Amino acid sequence: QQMGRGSMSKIVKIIGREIIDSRGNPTVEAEVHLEGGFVGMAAAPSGASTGSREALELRDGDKSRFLGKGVTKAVAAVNGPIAQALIGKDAKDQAGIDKIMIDLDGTENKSKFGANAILAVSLANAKAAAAAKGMPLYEHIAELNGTPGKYSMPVPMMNIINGGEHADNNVDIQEFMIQPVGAKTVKEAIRMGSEVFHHLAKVLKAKGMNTAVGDEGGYAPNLGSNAEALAVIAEAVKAAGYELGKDITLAMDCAASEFYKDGKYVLAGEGNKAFTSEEFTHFLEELTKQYPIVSIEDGLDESDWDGFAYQTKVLGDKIQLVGDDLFVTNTKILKEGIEKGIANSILIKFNQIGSLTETLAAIKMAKDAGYTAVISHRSGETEDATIADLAVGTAAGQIKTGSMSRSDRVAKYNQLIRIEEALGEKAPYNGRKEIKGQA
Amino acid sequence: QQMGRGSMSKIVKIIGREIIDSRGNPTVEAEVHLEGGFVGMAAAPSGASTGSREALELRDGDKSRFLGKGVTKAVAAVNGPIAQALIGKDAKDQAGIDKIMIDLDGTENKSKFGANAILAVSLANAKAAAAAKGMPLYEHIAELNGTPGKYSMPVPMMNIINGGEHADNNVDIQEFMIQPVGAKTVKEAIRMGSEVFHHLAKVLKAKGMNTAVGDEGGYAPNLGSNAEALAVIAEAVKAAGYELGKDITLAMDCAASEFYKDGKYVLAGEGNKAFTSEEFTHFLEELTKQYPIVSIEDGLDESDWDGFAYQTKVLGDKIQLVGDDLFVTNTKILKEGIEKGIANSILIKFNQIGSLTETLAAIKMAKDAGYTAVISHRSGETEDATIADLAVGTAAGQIKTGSMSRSDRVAKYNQLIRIEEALGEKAPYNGRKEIKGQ
Ligand SMILES: O=C(O)[C@@H](CO)OP(=O)(O)O
Ligand SMILES: O=C(O)[C@@H](CO)OP(=O)(O)O
Ligand SMILES: [Mg+2]
Ligand SMILES: [Mg+2]
Ligand SMILES: [Mg+2]
Ligand SMILES: [Mg+2]
């Protein structure tokens, strides 16, 4: 008899604008407004170590604004042709929204509007539609995902020593992470992570090492070797009163595409020590015997599918092996990997692909093949906490969102604390059992 | 005939929780829920270089959690006594809401509930009320401030080299800042700050210096003296195509309390070189003749009222002199300062005093005396961007909210972008003329 405003879910206005990311570079934000008054807003993150097969981040290249990194062309796409094509379409039909954008762009890699344009609208639409449906974003995402009412709290992997392209130090390995597997709630995980991070500062200070931070909030000391990162972490974990293995495990992201040069893996920080893919796999293996490293991401170059097959055959039964730049959140590429016995896990970045629909497709493909899905930030973030809702609503099981410093990382942890407080035992924290090779 | 939902602004629920700040330490967030379905939420920031007369940041001291930095006691005050005293009160009456809190706590420095509890609720209530009134927080703030419809976009001072308690380096001066006074909009100011900030990384990398960042998102290199920070900034400004003076001016915050020891100022990064008040003031003057430094905060110790009287007599006609730990956003203390010819500017930190009402009273007191008010962050921040709306709604004219890196800082710039986009020329960007002495 009366039609509620929630039913009035057609898009009436889309506003694109240029905001600033956690490195000080421009990025795209969009707002999507519905007839019933609902609004969602979101922003595109931005990577530094970008895989060569990522959907295109469109920047302006005008050296007179922001050293060429303006995003006015992307924002113009949001405000002009994207908006014109979505006005009057039902925001609750996520897959329908995304399809109109992807089709209008018409390109493989989203190079006409930019993946930055399309993603911001895609995520803002989802938020809008959640609110039109009368629910929080994680609940709407589980509905979009085909898994209604099913949630979990992700096991975070927390990058507390930063290197490679994220920092100005002599460390080649991009990320050294802790995982609070012994925690019973993500709130407890967050606190354990904070404690270890603070004890790590004390460890580093006593050795005369720098405690300023890199792009993801972890320390960026100069170390005598990439392995030494592991020793200092171990030290800190023990100083915080925790058992390495039992309470806390380790993970790494090598981002090895960043140090592959003329067909070899070259550790610049270790006097340009060069390795073939087999030898580099053996280097990684020796680390996994000395420390409880249970996950390794991008252990080899994006293009070295032979090397990945090998690595997966030698390490994959025991260790989670995460493809990041290997897969670029891309069903086309993940499928071929799954067929070739390559990796057993994927890092999910909605901006590697450019829409929430395509991102949920990549999570489905991984889950169906027994691969784990790790929901990830980019090194260039904003105060946006969307990935926390994505992790819970897809019950992905794991999240990669930074050190326990910088609100560009800590805003996602706080969103996790909020979600867990509303859901309680409806969103279990499953611990080490979420990680490939431990269940 | 029909009463709208916006009229149902009575408080129905208040929720407190422990969340995490930009250094990884706990802080208090509160949500305030109104009958008509309106919700506000906010969090308390937290300083590292905290004034000895700041209202109390209540922490737990339970060494088994967060190294003793838990805020469970504060959160309990929000969830029990505070909530129970405000449920049923009209959120639109900010002054009454803050009164009930202040009075129930009943101590001078909010040491029963903590200023962290009271502030979180205070701000969350304002958010709720704005929503109930159908308006952005900056517009509700202007009505609460007794200055309806009157706005400006603040001129930011951007701390791009970090020292003292904000960074693990050999720099004594806590902050070295740029201000993009030549900009016509706060959006252009933010662009100019980004550009200079990125040219600064290049200048420091050319010199072999570290480009990791301190707590406020500025670089934290080791330097050969404190004044070297100004030289590298000036290099950066020129490399960015800008003119120091005309486009960009400089500002400092010495946080000199942090290097005051047995009655002298001691520059530990320059071989423990000791200064009396007078000779530290002369050190500062010398920097003001070499570089276009137009504002200096906390040039002396919070307790050295005699020295500030001097510094103001000597430097105050031509430079802005901002009291921070000197005044602790506290009208009782600013009043005595204004009476004794001390400083000509105040740094406004809502958590130094613990309520939005007392913060607006400090802003009023300053403007009535012709002092400027600089709206400030703390070094421990959250994604909260309230200080952007506070700066605009009180047309304070200046803001101190970080380097152009770390979302704990950039969230405030983004919110200033959004505000200016909505207000256009109803919030002018007044540039250089906002600064005391210009
Ligand atoms: O390589 C990565 O996994 C990410 C996230 O840490 O960094 P970037 O956004 O720089 O690709
Ligand atoms: O001293 C200051 O002005 C502030 C803001 O930079 O730092 P803290 O919050 O550590 O007091
Ligand atoms: Mg990368
Ligand atoms: Mg990688
Ligand atoms: Mg201070
Ligand atoms: Mg100070």
Helix axes B356-368, B115-133, angle to 10 degrees: 90
A408 touches B at CB < 8 Å: yes
CB count, 10 Å around CB of A324? 28
- Gap between the Cα atoms of B259 and B265, Å rounded: 6
B220 and B287 part of one domain: yes
B409: Cβ below 6 Å to ligand 2? no
CA separation for the pair B165, B217 (Å, rounded): 13
Question: Which structure tokens are listed for A230?
Answer: 């592991």
Spell B183-201 as b/e; 16+ CB within 10 A means b: bebbbebbbbbbbbbbbbb
In a domain, B390, yes or no: yes
| Of the residues A71, A104, A134, the one at which a domain ends | A134
Question: Is B3 within the bounds of a domain?
Answer: no
Tell me whether residue A255 is exposed, middle or buried, using C-beta atoms within 10 angstroms of its C-beta: 0 to 12, 13 to 18, 19 or more: buried
Cβ–Cβ contacts within 10 Å for residue B422, how many?
A: 12
**In angstroms, what separates the C-alpha of A406 from chain B's closest C-alpha?**
5
Please give the resolution of this entry in Å, rounded to 1 decimal.
Answer: 1.8
Closest CA relative to residue B333, chosen from B293, B374, B365, B298: B365
The candidate with the shortest Cα–Cα distance to B132, out of B101, B89, B96, is B89
Say if residue B432 is in the same domain as residue B283.
Answer: yes
CA distance B94 to chain A (A): 26
| Residue A75 maps to a domain | yes
CB contact at 8 A, B342 and B115: no
Number of other CB atoms surrounding residue A88 within 10 Å: 9
Residue B4 lies in a domain: no
What are the CA-CA distances from residue A207 to residues A76, A179, A204 (Å)? 51, 24, 5
User: Among residues 186-225 of chain B, which lie with CB inside 8 Å of chain A?
Assistant: 190-191, 193-195, 197-198, 205, 210-214, 220
Identify the helix (H) or strand (E) that includes residue B326. none
CA-to-CA distance for B420 and B399, rounded, in angstroms?
14
Same domain, residue pair B403 and B365: yes
The count of structural domains within chain B is 2
Paired tokens of B375: 């709206």
Domain boundary among A83, A103, A134: A134
Picking from B167, B220, B407, the nearest residue to A381 by CB comes out as B407
Cβ atoms within 10 Å of A313's Cβ, excluding its own: 12
Sheet of strand B11-20, all strands in order from the earlier edge strand to the far edge: B11-20, B26-34, B39-43
Same domain, B172 and B68: no
The span from the CA of A222 to the CA of A10, in Å, is: 54
B134, B150, B184: which is the final residue of a domain? B134
SS3 A297: strand
A293: CB partners within 8 A, 6+ apart: A230, A249, A250, A251, A252, A287, A319
Helix (H, G, I), strand (E, B) or coil at A322: strand
B382 reaches A (C-beta below 8 A): yes
Q: A286-306: string of b/e by CB count within 10 Å (b at 16+)?
A: ebbeebbbbbbbbbbbbebee
DSSP A65-125: SGGGT--HHHHHHIIIIIHHHHTTSBTT-HHHHHHHHHHHH-STT-TTT-HHHHHHHHHHH
Do B188 and B103 reside in the same domain of the chain? Answer: no
Active site residues of A: 216, 349
CB of A434 within 8 Å of a chain B CB? The answer is: no
Q: Is B187 annotated as a binding residue?
A: no
Residue B82 has what DSSP assignment? I
Question: Does B98 fall in a domain?
Answer: yes
DSSP B16: E
Q: Are residues A232 and A242 in the same domain?
A: yes
Report helix, strand or coil for B194: helix
Dist. CA B223–CA B230, nearest whole Å: 11
Amino acid at B400: K
Helices A94-105 and A356-368: crossing angle in degrees, nearest 10, is 110
Residues B94 and B129: beta-carbon distance below 8 Å = yes
Sign of CA dihedral B83, B86, B92, B97: negative
Residues of chain A with Cβ-Cβ distance to B24 below 8 Å are 193-194, 197-198, 403-405, 410
Residue A322, in any domain of the structure: yes
Please indicate if the annotation marks B378 as binding a ligand.
yes
Supply angle C-alpha B273, B251, B179, rounded to 5.
155
The amino acid at A149: G
Is B379 among the annotated ligand-binding positions? yes
Tell whether ligand 2 has an atom less than 6 A from the beta carbon of residue B379: yes
Measured CA to CA, the distance from residue A46 to residue A27 in angstroms comes to 8
**Residue ranges making up the domain that contains A106:** 10-134
Q: Are strands B273-275 and B372-376 parallel, antiparallel or unpaired?
A: unpaired
- What angle in degrees, to the nearest 10, is found between the helix axes of B137-144 and B115-133? 110
DSSP-assigned letter for residue A259 = G
Residues of B in contact with A18 (CB under 8 A): 417
Bridge-based pairing of strands A175-179 and A397-400 is unpaired
- CA–CA distances in Å: residue A2 to residues A5, A7, A92: 10, 10, 20
Query: Distances from the Cα of B108 to the Cαs of B80, B111, B337, B357, in angstroms?
Result: 21, 7, 19, 15
CB within 8 Å of A234: residues ≥ 6 apart:
A244, A291
Assigned token pair, B321: 């002199």
Nearest to B415 by CA among B60, B88, B214, B154: B154
Q: Which of A364, A363, A437, A424 is nearest to A399 (CA)?
A: A363
CB within 8 Å of B308: residues ≥ 6 apart:
B299, B300, B321, B323, B326, B337, B342, B343
- Of the bound ligands, which one is closest to the alpha carbon of residue B255? 6
For residue B5, is it within any domain? no
- Roughly how many angstroms between the first and final C-alpha of chain B, as a whole number? 55
B419 and B373 share one domain: yes
Which residues, 6+ apart, have CB-to-CB distance to A224 below 8 Å? none
Same domain assignment for residues B113 and B140: no
CATH of the domain at A288: 3.20.20.120
Q: Which runs of consecutive H residues, i.e. helices, occur in B218-276?
A: 228-239
Q: Which helix (H) or strand (E) holds B9?
A: none
Within 8 A by CB and 6+ apart from B267, the residues are: B172, B226, B259, B273, B275
Q: Give A223's contacts in chain B (Cβ within 8 Å).
A: none
Query: What is the domain-level CATH number for residue A95?
Result: 3.30.390.10
Neighbouring residues of B386: CB distance < 8 A, sequence distance ≥ 6: B42, B123, B137, B350
Q: Which residue do the tokens 């330097």 mark?
A: B223
Statement to judge: residues A117 and A260 lie in one domain: no
- Token representation of residue A260: 């592959």
B213 closest CA partner among A23, A47, A195: A23
Same domain, A50 and A40: yes
Which residues, at least 6 apart from A286, have a Cβ–Cβ distance to it below 8 Å?
none
Q: Do B190 and A382 touch (CB under 8 A)?
A: no
| Main-chain dihedrals φ then ψ at residue A256, nearest 5 degrees | -70, -20
If asked whether residues B245 and B171 sit together in one domain, one would say: yes
Residues A114 and A143 in one domain: no
Position A4 in a domain: no
Bridge partners (DSSP) of residue B401 are: none
- Distance of alpha carbon B251 from alpha carbon B58, whole angstroms: 32
